[PDB]
């Protein structure tokens, strides 16, 4: 379930397992030195049969690895206080105001902050000035009869902005 391709692969699947087991081993293991010991031990256990030219025995060892992992996880895996699941999970979302607002203000406060609204207005003219031709031509131009991907090409043509960028650029600053 991922934007790039239809699956992870074998490689990244093993990799995510290694990240999870190392993270759980943090969450199991305090004092950081025995942590470092057991981390090198775990790396050696993956080093034992890294170089199988076989594939089916490798993926079977992957499944038996997942069994001994899920038997040995932690009750509180150590989630960082910025991640979803974690302590924050858009903690300061109280002030994550989208910027389609701030133009519906009374012109007294548009007189209170003048230069900002002048440059914001030329931003919106930058948006609309290159909205129709380049962006919609680049979208209906390149792909197959079905799109069949979730990436999108840049604006390498000559000049102006890559397509469909407004709600990517204009976001909250994640600590206001």
């Amino acid at each position: 379930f991922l934007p790039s391709a239809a699956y992870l692969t074998h490689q990244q699947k093993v990799l995510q397992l290694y990240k999870r087991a190392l993270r759980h081993l943090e969450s199991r293991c305090v004092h950081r030195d025995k942590y470092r010991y057991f981390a090198c031990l775990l790396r050696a256990r993956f080093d034992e049969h890294k170089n199988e030219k076989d594939m089916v025995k490798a993926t079977q060892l992957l499944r038996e690895a997942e069994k001994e992992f899920w038997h040995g996880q932690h009750p509180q895996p150590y989630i960082f206080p910025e991640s979803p699941g974690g302590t924050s999970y858009e903690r300061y979302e109280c002030y994550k105001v989208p910027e389609w607002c701030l133009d519906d203000w009374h012109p007294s406060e548009k007189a209170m902050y003048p230069d900002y609204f002048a440059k914001r207005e030329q931003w919106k003219k930058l948006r609309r000035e290159s909205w129709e031709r380049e962006v919609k031509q680049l979208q209906e131009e390149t792909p197959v009869g079905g799109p069949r991907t979730e990436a999108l090409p840049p604006a390498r043509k000559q000049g102006d902005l890559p397509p469909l960028w407004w709600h990517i650029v204009t976001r909250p600053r994640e600590r206001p």
Binding site: E90, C94, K96, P98, W100, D104
Partner: protein, 459 residues
């Protein structure tokens, strides 16, 4: 009382012979003047009711409901613009005069003396509700809504007429006093059971009771805001007022014949509070909330304690204000996005940072936050029904729990956590909706201070 009847009439040719940008100030100003005019009424004292004629009178059950009606008209009349100001001038004038004729028949109904006159004014209360909700029902099934509406209300309220004519020509005239002072008890022949069943079943339909509440949700999800506020507050508490009066007769068989309806009301109160926990169409949650509070009303009416009638009338007035306010807030949100669904319009603690204050305040009244009136109502009804039986408090408390959770779900569902950030059209709050919230929640807290007014005849 004709001092209230006749300016409510003369507010109608007013609206005809004003013009564009001229109807509005006249209607709203003069309707507020009539609100002061019936704030003058409250004189009622001691021995009996007070008689405004050889024809009209006011019980102290009728005074707060009547004042609530004349309070609720100008609020409504302001509330029902911006969804019809772009329609035609003649149709707009017809709309305002429709509501004024509606209020006129409501005053006629509440200040009745004869129960036959009460019945005529009952269905004259009915017919403008129909025309409003069908002409501006604003969704594809306003047809079915009006059709269900009128056939449930008439075909329940039809044999009520027959029972009252039969009582008329077996016990003389029909003053409420001469209904009193002359009522003799009537035993358990099956004709008595059917007569009681006829009267009580017609008002059961109008409350609603549980087996006849699918009258309601179409008739509020496909109504305009004016007819919805009208329908909820004034019409449901009008049905309760009718049963509160005509339960004076036929006390010696209501004990034997009241057992199925209480149990229907209790298990349906639990089921209705459960069914408003999971629905979409946010407008309908207030409707099922209204069925929950009216089920508690019906428990309070069929038990016959003075404790119970005090709790019943307080629960009536507080739920009328809560539901009318909360319908107006849901109309504000539907004016924002063209959805009516629940899970769509989200966020809004950030944006409109004081619309949420009114949502919070109404949600805590519907919780029955304790200085408010709705807790006074629910608490005295629970006291009276616990003296009725040592067992029913399971149902009342479980109603309190599920009521807390759906009301809080209404609060923190649509107005908590994340705006969907493809909305980008909601305007900051107008002065008008702020005024409407202000007109709801000043009198609710002001009665929260001094509530000895609104308790019933058995004060």
């Amino acid at each position: 009382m004709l001092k209230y009847i006749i300016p409510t009439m003369m507010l109608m040719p007013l609206t005809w012979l004003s013009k564009n940008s001229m109807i509005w100030i006249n209607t709203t100003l003069h309707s507020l003047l009539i609100s002061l005019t019936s704030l003058l009424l409250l004189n009622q004292f001691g021995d009996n009711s007070l008689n405004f004629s050889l024809t009209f009178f006011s019980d102290s059950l009728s005074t707060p409901l009547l004042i609530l009606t004349m309070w609720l008209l100008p609020l409504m009349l302001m509330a029902s613009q911006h969804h019809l100001s772009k329609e035609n001038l003649a149709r707009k004038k017809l709309f305002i005069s429709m509501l004024i004729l509606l209020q006129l028949f409501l005053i006629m109904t509440f200040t009745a003396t004869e129960l036959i006159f009460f019945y005529i004014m009952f269905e004259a209360t009915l017919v403008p509700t129909l025309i409003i909700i069908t002409r501006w029902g604003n969704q594809t099934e306003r047809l079915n809504a009006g059709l269900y509406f009128l056939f449930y209300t008439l075909a329940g309220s039809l044999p009520l007429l027959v029972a009252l004519i039969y009582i008329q020509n077996t016990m003389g005239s029909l003053n409420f006093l001469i209904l009193q002072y002359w009522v003799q008890p009537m035993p358990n022949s099956w004709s008595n059971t059917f007569m009681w069943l006829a009267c009580m079943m017609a008002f059961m339909v109008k409350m609603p009771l549980y087996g006849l509440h699918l009258w309601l949700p179409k008739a509020h999800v496909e109504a305009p805001i004016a007819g919805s506020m009208v329908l909820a507050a004034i019409l449901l508490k009008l049905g309760g007022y009718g049963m509160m009066r005509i339960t004076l007769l036929l006390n010696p068989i209501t004990d034997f014949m009241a057992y199925p309806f209480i149990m229907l009301s209790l298990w349906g109160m639990i089921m209705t509070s459960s069914i408003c926990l999971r629905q979409t169409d946010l407008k309908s949650l207030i409707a099922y909330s209204s069925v929950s509070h009216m089920a508690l009303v019906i428990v309070a009416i069929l038990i016959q304690t003075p404790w119970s009638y005090m709790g019943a009338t307080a629960l009536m007035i507080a739920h009328g204000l809560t539901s009318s306010m909360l319908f107006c807030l849901a109309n504000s949100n539907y004016e924002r996005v063209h959805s009516r669904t629940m899970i769509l319009a989200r966020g809004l603690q950030t944006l409109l940072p004081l619309m949420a204050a009114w949502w919070l305040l109404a949600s805590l009244t519907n919780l029955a936050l304790p200085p408010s009136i709705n807790l006074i109502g629910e608490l005295f009804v629970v006291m009276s029904t616990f003296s009725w039986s040592n067992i029913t408090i399971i149902l009342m408390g479980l109603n309190m729990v599920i009521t807390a959770l759906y009301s809080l779900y209404m609060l923190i569902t649509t107005q908590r956590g994340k705006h969907t950030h493809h909305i980008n059209n909601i305007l900051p709050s107008f002065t008008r909706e702020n005024a409407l919230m202000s007109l709801h929640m000043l009198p609710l807290l002001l009665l929260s201070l001094n509530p000895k007014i609104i308790l019933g005849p058995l004060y």
